[PDB]
């Protein structure tokens, strides 16, 4: 298996109309299986175990930034195939790589090998 992308990022919880970040910082990485299916997984840094694992089909979801709450790097994953969306925050000190990771995520979820 190969990891298309991987960067330190924590997940969040959006309920009703309020977004609350999770202190359980993890790692957002993408891996393509021999089935040519891109796997979107989120591993918690607390235990280093993969807490999330779901295959993302082409154009299934969109990875974008949410410039609504100024304070840090916040991104949101929206599933075009459905109406469910997730929120994440980068843990990288510098965004010099956050932007690339963001682009790569969209490339692996919208432009798989």
């Amino acid at each position: 298996n190969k990891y298309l992308v991987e960067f330190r990022a924590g997940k969040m919880s959006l309920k009703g109309t309020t977004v609350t970040p999770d202190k359980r910082k993890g790692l957002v990485y993408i891996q393509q299986t021999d089935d040519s299916l891109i796997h979107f997984c989120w591993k918690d840094r607390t235990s280093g175990n993969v807490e999330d694992d779901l295959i993302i089909f082409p154009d299934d979801c969109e990875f974008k930034r949410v410039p609504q709450c100024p304070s840090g790097r916040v991104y949101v994953l929206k599933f075009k195939a459905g109406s469910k969306r997730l929120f994440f925050w980068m843990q990288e000190p510098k965004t010099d790589q956050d932007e690339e990771h963001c682009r790569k995520v969209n490339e692996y979820l919208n432009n798989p090998p």
Binding site: T17, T18, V19, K23, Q68, C69, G72, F87, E92
Partner: peptide, 14 residues
């Protein structure tokens, strides 16, 4: 060293 986590905020599809 590492950046601190963000604080809770309201999100509205404007």
């Amino acid at each position: 060293q590492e950046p601190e986590p963000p604080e809770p905020f309201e999100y509205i599809d404007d």
